[PDB]
Amino acid sequence: VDFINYHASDVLETSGWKSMVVSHPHLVAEAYRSLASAQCPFLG
Amino acid sequence: GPVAESWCYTQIKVVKFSYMWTINNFSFCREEMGEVIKSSTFSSGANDKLKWCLRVNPKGLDEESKDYLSLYLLLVSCPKSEVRAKFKFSILNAKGEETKAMESQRAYRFVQGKDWGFKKFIRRDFLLDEANGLLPDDKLTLFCEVSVVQDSVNISGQNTMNMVKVPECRLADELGGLWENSRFTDCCLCVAGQEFQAHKAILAARSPVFSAMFEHEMEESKKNRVEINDVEPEVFKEMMCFIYTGKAPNLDKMADDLLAAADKYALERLKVMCEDALCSNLSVENAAEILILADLHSADQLKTQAVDFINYHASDVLETSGWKSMVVSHPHLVAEAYRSLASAQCPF
C-alpha cells in the first residue's frame, strides 16, 4: 500500500489496478485510507 | 436629495487577484547574495488573459538590502498595451493571520518585463528570529492581493424623457395563477392517490420527457388520466410550481429530493439550481450522502465539487459512518475519490 501510495501516478495506469478495482473494493478503500489519513493537510 | 433630469454614472472597472504562495525549507536557500527564485504564472478566471508572476531575493538585491528580504511583483505577458494596478503584500504567520503587511499607494505602470515592488520589504534577521513566529516549520507563506484598473465607461443615463413606464413582466404571475386557481385544466394526474390538475401544452413546452410520453400511447386512449407513483406530492407540487412560474420559492427545505426528481424528469435548469442548494449544504457529516445522490442522479458539477470537498476534508470524512456505508455500497465512488486524490497528490 505504501509503494502504491508513492507510485500513485503509475499504479493507476496498469491493467492489474483496473482488475483489483473491479474485483476488490476494500483494498482500494484501505489504499485511500493510507493515502489520506496517513497524510494531510497539504495546504489547499 | 433632488432628482436631476440628466445623470451619468462613470465606472472604471476593477478586478482582483487573490494569491497564496508557499515555499518549503527556507533554511536551504542554497545561495548567497544575487539569487532569485520565481513563482508560477498565475491569473484569475476572468479574463484569464492577464498573466502575472512573482520573484523574491532571499538575501537582497543591493548592498542596502543585505539584511532585507526583497519582494517584487512582475508582469510576464499581457495582450493589452499597458496595464496599471495597485498591489498589497502580506506575510501569513503560524496562526494563520497577517503580520508585517504593507502596500503601495501609487497605481504603478506595468508593461511586458517590468518589475515593481519594495526592495526593503522585511528585515532578514527579524524573519530569522523565532520569537515572532513568522517562520512556521521552516516554511514561508505570502498573501498577495492586487487590483487591476480598466478603461472608463459612461452609461449616460437620461431621465424624465417619458413619464410612462411598462410593467416588466406579469406573465409569471398569471402562470402562477394557472396553478392555484387551476383555470380549467386538461389532464389530471395521480400522485399516490392525490389528484393534481395540469395543462397539456405548457408541460411539453419545457419537459423533454413529458413531450414524448404525452403524444405516444397516452393521448389516443387515456388522454385524461396518467399516474405518477414514484415521487411524493409534497415535493411534486413544488416541482410543478416551477414549470409554470419559471422559479421555485421553496427550494432549500426539500432540495434533497427535488434534485432526485430533477434528473428523473430531465429538467436542466431545475437540476442546476438544486445542485446549487446541495452544493451550498456541503459539510463533512453529509458528504457521503451528497456524493451518492450526485452519482445516482447523473450530477456532474455537484459530483466534481463534492469530491473536491472530500479530498480536502478527508481527515474527518473517513470518520463518518456514512463514508463506511458508501465504501461497502458503491466501490466506484471510492475508486473515483482515489483517482482524484492521486491527481491532487501527483508530486508525492
Add this chain to the structure above:
Amino acid sequence: GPVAESWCYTQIKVVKFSYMWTINNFSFCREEMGEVIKSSTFSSGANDKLKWCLRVNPKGLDEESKDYLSLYLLLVSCPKSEVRAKFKFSILNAKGEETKAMESQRAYRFVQGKDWGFKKFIRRDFLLDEANGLLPDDKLTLFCEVSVVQDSVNISGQNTMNMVKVPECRLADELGGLWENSRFTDCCLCVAGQEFQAHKAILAARSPVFSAMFEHEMEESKKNRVEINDVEPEVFKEMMCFIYTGKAPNLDKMADDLLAAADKYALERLKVMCEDALCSNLSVENAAEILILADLHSADQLKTQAVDFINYHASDVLETSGWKSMVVSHPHLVAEAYRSLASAQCPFL
C-alpha cells in the same frame, strides 16, 4: 485564514543520509601527519548513484592541525554535474549518545572529487582523554548526516472557485416559441378570413375582453370559429405576439393603430408602450391627429404630453392644415388644449 483564488506551492525536496562508522583499536594509528583512512563508498535510495565517502586524518593535515583529528566529507559519484548539500558530523561517547557537534551552515557546492569539512574537528588530547569517554573500548564510532537538495518544482493549485450558475428565466421566449409552434391548439382565431390560432386560458389571463367573452357561456360555439373584424392582421400578429412573448420587436413602424388595438382590448401595458412610442414622434405638424387618437383611445399620459407640445410649439401648429381639420371636426379637444395653456406656462402679464 482567508480564502484566495490561486494557491502556489514551490517545494524543495531534501533527501537525508544516515551513516555511522566504527573503527576498532584506533590507538595504533601507526602514522604521523600525512596518512588518510577512507572508508567504503555508500549511498541511500536516491537514484543509487550519489556515492559518498569519509576521509579522516588521525594526526592531521598540517602544523595547524597538529593537535586535531581532521574530518572531511568527499563525493565520488554523482549523475548530475553539480550537487550542493549541507552536512553534519558527530562522535559517540561511552554510553552511545551524540557528542561534540559542529555545523557548516552553507550549502557547499560539491563536485566529483571535491572535499569540505572541519580541519580542526576535535582536540586530539580531548579525544584521547579517557575520562571524557570519547574513546570507549578504544573504539571510534562516528555519525554523519548528509542533507542533499535538488531542483524545486511548482504545483500552482487553483482551488475551486465558482458558484454553479443558474440559467436566465427563459419563461418569455420559451412560451414565445409556443406562438410559432402552435402545439395542442385549442382555438383558431379568425381575422379577415386569414387564420391565426391560440389557446383560451392564456388569452383570458392577459386581457379583460377575452376574460369576459371566454366565460359568458360561449365555449362550444365561439371558441371553434371565433371571429374578429376590426384589427388588420399585420397589427394583430404583433399584438398577439405581445400577449404571449411580452415584447414588441417592430413597434416603431406600426405604433399608430396598435394603440387603438390596445385600447380596444384593454391591454394596458401595450397602451402605455404605444403612448411611449408615439411620444417620441411629435413633429411640428402631426400633433393634431396624435391628440385626436389619444382622445378617442383614452391615452391620457400621451394626451397631456401632446397638449404640452401644442402649447409650446403652437406658433407653428396652427399654420398647418391639421389644426384646421381639428377645429372643424373636434370642437371639444380645443377646450382642454386652451385650458392647459390658459392656467399654466405664460400668465405673467
